[PDB]
Amino acid sequence: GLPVLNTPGSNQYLTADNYQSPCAIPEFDVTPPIDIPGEVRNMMELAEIDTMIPLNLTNQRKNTMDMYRVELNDAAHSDTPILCLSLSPASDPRLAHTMLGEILNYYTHWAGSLKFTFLFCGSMMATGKLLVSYAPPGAEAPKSRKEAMLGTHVIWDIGLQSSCTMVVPWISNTTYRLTINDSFTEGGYISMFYQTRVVVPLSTPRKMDILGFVSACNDFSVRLLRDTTHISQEA
Amino acid sequence: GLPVLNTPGSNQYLTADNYQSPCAIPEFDVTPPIDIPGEVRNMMELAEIDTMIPLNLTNQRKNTMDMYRVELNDAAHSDTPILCLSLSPASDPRLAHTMLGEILNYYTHWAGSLKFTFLFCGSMMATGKLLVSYAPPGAEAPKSRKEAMLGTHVIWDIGLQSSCTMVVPWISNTTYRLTINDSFTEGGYISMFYQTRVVVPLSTPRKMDILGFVSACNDFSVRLLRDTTHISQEA
Amino acid sequence: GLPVLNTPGSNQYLTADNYQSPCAIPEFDVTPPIDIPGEVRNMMELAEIDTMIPLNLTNQ
Amino acid sequence: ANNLPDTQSSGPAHSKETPALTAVETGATNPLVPSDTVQTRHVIQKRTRSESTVESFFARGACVAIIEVDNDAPTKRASKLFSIWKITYKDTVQLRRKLEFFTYSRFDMELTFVVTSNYTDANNGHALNQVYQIMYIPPGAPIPGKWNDYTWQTSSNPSLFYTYGAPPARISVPYVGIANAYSHFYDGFAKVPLAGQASTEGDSLYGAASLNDFGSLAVRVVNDHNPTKLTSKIRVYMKPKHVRVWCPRPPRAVPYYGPGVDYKDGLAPLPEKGLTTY
Amino acid sequence: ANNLPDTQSSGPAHSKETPALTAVETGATNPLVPSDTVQTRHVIQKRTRSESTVESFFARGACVAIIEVDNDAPTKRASKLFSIWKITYKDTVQLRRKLEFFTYSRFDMELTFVVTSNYTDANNGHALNQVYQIMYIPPGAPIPGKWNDYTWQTSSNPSLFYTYGAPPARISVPYVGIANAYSHFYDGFAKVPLAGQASTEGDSLYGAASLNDFGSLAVRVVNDHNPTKLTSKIRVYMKPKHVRVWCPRPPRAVPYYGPGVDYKDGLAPLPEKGLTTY
Amino acid sequence: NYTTINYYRDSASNAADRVMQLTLGNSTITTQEAANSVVAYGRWPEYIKDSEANPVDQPTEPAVAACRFYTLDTVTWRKESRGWWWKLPDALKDMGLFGQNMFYHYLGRAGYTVHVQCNASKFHQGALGVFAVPEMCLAGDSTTHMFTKYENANPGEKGGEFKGSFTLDTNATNPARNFCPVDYLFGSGVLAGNAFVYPHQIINLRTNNCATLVLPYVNSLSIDSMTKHNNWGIAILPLAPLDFATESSTEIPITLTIAPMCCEFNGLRNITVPRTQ
Amino acid sequence: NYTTINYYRDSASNAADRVMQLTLGNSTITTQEAANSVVAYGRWPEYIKDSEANPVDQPTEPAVAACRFYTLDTVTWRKESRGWWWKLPDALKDMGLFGQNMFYHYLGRAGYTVHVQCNASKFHQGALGVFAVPEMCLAGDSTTHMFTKYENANPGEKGGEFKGSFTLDTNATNPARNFCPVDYLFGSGVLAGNAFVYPHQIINLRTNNCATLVLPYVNSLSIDSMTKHNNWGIAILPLAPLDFATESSTEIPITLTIAPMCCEFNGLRNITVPRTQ
Amino acid sequence: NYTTINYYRDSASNAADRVMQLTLGNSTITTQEAANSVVAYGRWPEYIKDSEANPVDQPTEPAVAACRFYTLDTVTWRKESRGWWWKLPDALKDMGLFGQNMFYHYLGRAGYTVHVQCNASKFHQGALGVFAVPEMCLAGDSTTHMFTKYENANPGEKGGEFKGSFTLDTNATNPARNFCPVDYLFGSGVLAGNAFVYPHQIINLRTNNCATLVLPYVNSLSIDSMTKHNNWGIAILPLAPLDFATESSTEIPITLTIAPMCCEFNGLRNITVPRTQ
Ligand SMILES: CCCCCCCCCCCCC/C=C/[C@H](O)[C@H](N)CO
Numbered sequence A, B: 001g002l003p004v005l006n007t008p009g010s011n012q013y014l015t016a017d018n019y020q021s022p023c024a025i026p027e028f029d030v031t032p033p034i035d036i037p038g039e040v041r042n043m044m045e046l047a048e049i050d051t052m053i054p055l056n057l058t059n060q061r062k063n064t065m066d067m068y069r070v071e072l073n074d075a076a077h078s079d080t081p082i083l084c085l086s087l088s089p090a091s092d093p094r095l096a097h098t099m100l101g102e103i104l105n106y107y108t109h110w111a112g113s114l115k116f117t118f119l120f121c122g123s124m125m126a127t128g129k130l131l132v133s134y135a136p137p138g139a140e141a142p143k144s145r146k147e148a149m150l151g152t153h154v155i156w157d158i159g160l161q162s163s164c165t166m167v168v169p170w171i172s173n174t175t176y177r178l179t180i181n182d183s184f185t186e187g188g189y190i191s192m193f194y195q196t197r198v199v200v201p202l203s204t205p206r207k208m209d210i211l212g213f214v215s216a217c218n219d220f221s222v223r224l225l226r227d228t229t230h231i232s233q234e235a
Numbered sequence C: 001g002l003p004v005l006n007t008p009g010s011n012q013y014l015t016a017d018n019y020q021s022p023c024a025i026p027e028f029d030v031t032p033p034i035d036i037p038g039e040v041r042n043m044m045e046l047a048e049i050d051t052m053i054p055l056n057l058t059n060q
Numbered sequence D, E: 001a002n003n004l005p006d007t008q009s010s011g012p013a014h015s016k017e018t019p020a021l022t023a024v025e026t027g028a029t030n031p032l033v034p035s036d037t038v039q040t041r042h043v044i045q046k047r048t049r050s051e052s053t054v055e056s057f058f059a060r061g062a063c064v065a066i067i068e069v070d071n072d073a074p075t076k077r078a079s080k081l082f083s084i085w086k087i088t089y090k091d092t093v094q095l096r097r098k099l100e101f102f103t104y105s106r107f108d109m110e111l112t113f114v115v116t117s118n119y120t121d122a123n124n125g126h127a128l129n130q131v132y133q134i135m136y137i138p139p140g141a142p143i144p145g146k147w148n149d150y151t152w153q154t155s156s157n158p159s160l161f162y163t164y165g166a167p168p169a170r171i172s173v174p175y176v177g178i179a180n181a182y183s184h185f186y187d188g189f190a191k192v193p194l195a196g197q198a199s200t201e202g203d204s205l206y207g208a209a210s211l212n213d214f215g216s217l218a219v220r221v222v223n224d225h226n227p228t229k230l231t232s233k234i235r236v237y238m239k240p241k242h243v244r245v246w247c248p249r250p251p252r253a254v255p256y257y258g259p260g261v262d263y264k265d266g267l268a269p270l271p272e273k274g275l276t277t278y
Numbered sequence F, G, H: 001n002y003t004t005i006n007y008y009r010d011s012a013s014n015a016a017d018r019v020m021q022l023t024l025g026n027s028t029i030t031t032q033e034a035a036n037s038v039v040a041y042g043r044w045p046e047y048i049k050d051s052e053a054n055p056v057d058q059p060t061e062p063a064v065a066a067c068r069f070y071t072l073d074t075v076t077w078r079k080e081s082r083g084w085w086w087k088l089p090d091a092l093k094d095m096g097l098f099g100q101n102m103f104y105h106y107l108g109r110a111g112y113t114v115h116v117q118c119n120a121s122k123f124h125q126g127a128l129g130v131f132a133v134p135e136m137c138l139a140g141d142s143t144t145h146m147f148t149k150y151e152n153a154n155p156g157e158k159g160g161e162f163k164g165s166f167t168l169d170t171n172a173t174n175p176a177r178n179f180c181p182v183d184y185l186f187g188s189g190v191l192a193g194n195a196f197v198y199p200h201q202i203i204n205l206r207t208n209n210c211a212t213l214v215l216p217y218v219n220s221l222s223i224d225s226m227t228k229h230n231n232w233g234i235a236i237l238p239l240a241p242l243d244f245a246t247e248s249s250t251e252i253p254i255t256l257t258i259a260p261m262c263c264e265f266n267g268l269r270n271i272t273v274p275r276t277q
């Protein structure tokens, strides 16, 4: 019939191809869809939902419910950090297993601003000011509030509103970052410090907890879908 | 000639494919069709024809003509069922071998309302009232008329009209049911009870027979054509 | 389906061919280009730049 | 094939109209819908009977023959260098039952040939790729007696030359019935015995006629024999196309026994279940 | 899937509006952007979420089954001349996790079959190219008991005949769920046990229903056995197409243990890291 | 959208109610307890159209001479009856000028009006399924396939009876070569309960005394040999067994009256004299 | 540009804020320390539309008789509490006419208004995550997969408690066949910190006393069996442990009030009496 | 003509003169013997455009505070000199407020004006090639690849010298981990004579006393870390050796004056204190 020439790539199976195939059940009467609540079109919609960060991965806290709580107290003011995180949303252990991290571990490249939301879970009678800081990479990781205040930061006043959002802006040399611990595409450093201190009256718990959440911003995106390392099979 | 690339799926034979092939008898003068009575376009047209149900599959009745007759008598009123069926039109033995069941056994999925037609084959001098009930699944199968009347049902008066149709409506969680005995897609329970009783005068047979028929409704449909288990070959 | 005939040259790989292939990373969000100085479209643009000649190729 | 009707809402009813009561003696199936006997809501139906069409029901390749051939040597009397297979769908049950759902049919056909070959022994060398000749022999045409006799010239007989390893061969056939439709059943004889003639003469098999005479397929391996024997099997898959059917019948309920409607075994197809057992 | 919004320049701010302060108790995620908390320049965004779409996320062929078959001899009891595989995505973890990101799904499917065969011994001769029959057996259809019983007529069952050496076989399936969507999770039972009946009756496995009953695949080698044994494996790759999903869930964090949500091992997925360690 | 193009010539290569009166000729039937009348497949019998005429010679249409009701031998319905069958036109081969035209011509065509009559009192029970089966092939009684002889396959107006159970004919020297129609298998390896896919009527003794079936000419050909091929088969089965007042031994007659309709015959020759049983 | 043409029939073959009042029936809830109210997936509960009705028989809509707030048994929140779970409609199976309609019908459908109440002083600490999980499947306690029995899977209004660590049921003779929901695994092998992908609200004792979740009917079917399938699962976890003034031993009640909404039932029969624990 | 049609979604799948004055801030340079001035790639330095801004936080632009000429340490040109190299911004890391902004921010961007000054009499000989090399990677001195340490790779304003011949560092205990730039290989395995593909100017002592190169910010990113990455490399090579009146031992100074231009910094934090040599 029609003269044809078989190019290279013939008879190959590429799992990413997009080709028409014969139907094995022709004329099947497909059940129509109903309007089910909660439809999702993009994985970034899930990445945009705040999920609690397992911040406290110490030996006795990891793999319990205590790994999500960070304990503050009413001690005297100090410049040492409350918590320190590395901005590796996919490879950092404290971030890898959040929903954002879980989605990023199916992709190779990511880019966009993040939001960290901290919720104060002390009593109504507790007051304080915290400093949540993001340092772009390149310099030494801030070991005191004096270093941390030189980077991006927010001073959080704990009052009638017990939650504060810090947006980590997209500050990268490359247009995309890798989802692995990588020096050339390192993200930066999140840290928390006491601004003044936590003050409580008498007959109040002197130790309280903060909970951490992370999510993506509307400018976030990923690409180069890959296989995750968070699931494996034996034999 | 024209550069071409051979995709995966080349050189395969799929029995469901739809491809053009060379004619082995070119220019054959095909005999024209005549108008033959009884043309069928859809298998559901056959499924819509009432066919007698082998309701009475007892040891001495199965695989005889007695398996189609259900014997009523003029005994005192009782709430025990006359007959009990499970709404599995393809897998239920009493329904599998009806024409509806035979067609459904070539398909994997089915959906739609059914009609059970019961014909009273007693004498003209016999009178009675029956209750034909359909219970959607989930609860215990009705063991007495008191349970059965809480489901869908029809009270059938045996008079000048000796036939009654009960429509089993389409009441399913899934948009389609399977054609096998399956818990998640179970159909329900058909049952028959005496409403009052069968009354005959003297010099009349005190035992009569009812015949059962089943068919599909115009909203019935099937899909995912498969191989039936009602025919097999040896060696 | 459509009758086809496989011409010679089918199933060959020519490193100079120009054919469409399936994408292994569909829907990838490609990083947009920025205006980088010093773009080159032709190798003759580089060939047109004066370069010093090693004229004196004596032993020493 | 097209969309089903919608379901209309039905409220309570109190009237002299009784769709439930009928008389099956008329031979007519009561065309009731759920709204006639129970209160119904409005359902915008989206299901369709597209896969229940007669075309979809038969739109599958069904194996109908496994023809065995050999390539060993002319001397070997135990090797069948060619095989003749009368064309019929009654050597297999599944397609036969699907077809015998109807008395009459009229359709084009698609024949697909899947050829698989193998060695029978190891210590005799190896073989080169084989070419198979499948010659269609319509009734009346000469039938090969040897694997290499003149009949295989195929000057007029259609012939398919299949190279082993190529995709399964395929041809299409129009409706080639001498009648206006294919007769799945023929309640009659080819001869009427006449008074006077001997009981030997005029005797014809019941239900057999020339309506179902379609010739045969002769399959051979065109190659000369290698020093080792090679056994091949051609599987024939038949797909009806442009199907029309008439006069539906109840499907076969008991095992087939021969080309006719005869039954001998498995006459008890139904199991035992209580009358009042769910 | 479409383009992201641009970044607008933001100067210094001194006002009573405090986007940073919120209340997560409401269950609502604060929709802040960088310009709300820091001074920003204008960036004309060119990145897109095209590869994050639900279609792209599932647009890969994922192995879901490795079916092993043999071609040795009927006598050999240790060789499995045919293999039946219940259709499911839970024999493998990767696709199972990607799917169980969502409670409900609705999609067409593409099945690709990659067949690889090998010899098992050397001193028994060689084999000819094999043909494999993959018969889809929907629930209720007869299941082959032997590799050459009547069930393989496939008069109604869809069947794929794959020639070894041809490109991997491929078929497409529409959405064939009896419900309006596939249920990745079913928080219930198929039976409700009723008061009075024995503990044996009414007992059903948790989370198991007929929503996920899709029949099986029966795979055999159509060829007769060569004097040497040949072992083949069919790898089934499932690609969702036209994917819709509903009700996102947190992904599986611990190893799967069976078809349900059960866990038994690896319950400590997170490593140890200091609170103030970067 | 998708694009389809045909690359071949032959299209095969392309991808895929109670009171009624019936008057025919000089015969008339009146019924008062009728369950209406069924027209098989909704097609009334008709003559061959010029657009479908295979034979070229002028047909003969005896009209009233042959298109009239002939009454067959009455059978008896008992409690033990399993059913009866007849073959058309075979059941009418000895019926007036219809049989004469049938045997004088090579080709014949006719539809039918079948009227089954079974009257019983208001104190009787029983139901009869009356089925018109196109190509009513029946199973034989021997291990040899398709071995039924012509004489038994064409019993005539008496027809045959269904059997409760299958019996195998082991007489090798003198095989019976007769049918063995099993009632619950409908005589053809199919469950009798599905026989209602065929055109049919039920005579329920409490409702109706008779059944009427208008069979069009059904065949894969426009016209065929009536001596070779039986176009239709009339099968009567007791769906509900006969019963009466517990007296027992009750038996009521079933009478069959068939009128051929739109008879056409072609190929006049000397008369055919088939071999007799 | 590129060109796409479909060569097949079936499309499958184609290429790829604080003060609030809630009144339902004769029940009313007033709140002054509310953290707003969440509508799960932004969809308000509704009745089945005629375009999506699977069952044909007329539904029954008890309206105010069943669409009203029922209060469940109060639980106690301590420092050692790991969390609690309930299943809907299972938690309401013994609640007024709602449970009666639930057990008298084969099919049932309802959305919910869940109101969790936990009041504490201004000198208390603690946070509760209240999560509505569609198809809240929980892990069992045995090496046998999916082995949890119906009686334990449907505790009723009491619900169940989460566990700190997984314990395996080794009793072969008399297996417990109960759930083993681990709090940090959310009872389903998923980290609890990601549970916020589900509709949820946090009760922070310094901010709010209550949480309100409006759950639409969520299922792969328009209507299902309420006795077989639990549409929703309410999980309450202590995100921040309860603490108070260093006194210790403090415990505050958590009360759950659920109102079914837009109840529809189909398939009336005799009542279902499920087997009890 | 030929026809092309794309069968895929992703486009990747598709088929293939003398007197001059320069004033920056409070600094001014006057030249009278200039050989014009080169703008590298014809692109003048500029600020990041909103269409290409990766970081979102507001940048700081010190303008005149940092966009001004800083003079580096003078080197001496002798007959035996092989050449010198500097890295930008590394050569300016200790230069006024420019270095302060460089070390206080995570991201920095700047173009440059490089002014090389070398005055000699009319009785001197010699030519200097002054090359601006983007990504001026230099070869190390050990068998270990890419083993040069940060301290040596960033010498500062002193820069480094080219070498006549390659020497291998065999000290295993205390490796130098320094560069080994060979003059005729341009320090990167490429012939020095081809180095003129880079933006450049030649100071021929008979013609001009100075060279001026306007380097735009060149990088694969719009903005990067100045402490990690050196955007530019300034390489000076004697093309023609220095000679004078046969006196011998003559040496003339070469002074380098670099002004950063269009400085932008992002990511303010505590200052970076890099490890010193
Ligand atoms: C090219 C040579 C070999 C292949 C050509 C063989 C052509 C034979 C086709 C005509 C005979 C078969 C026609 C149809 C078969 C049966 O009549 C149908 N199954 C009847 O239902």
Ligand SMILES: CCCCCCCCCCCCC/C=C/[C@H](O)[C@H](N)CO
Residues within 6 Å of the ligand: A024, E087, E088, E089, E099, E105, E109, E111, E134, E135, E136, E158, E159, E160, E171, E173, E176, E182, E212, E214, E217, E238
């Ligand atoms: C041609 C014969 C063999 C190939 C045909 C096999 C067809 C089987 C397709 C229907 C059953 C599978 C449908 C989809 C599978 C699961 O439900 C999905 N992974 C659910 O998420």
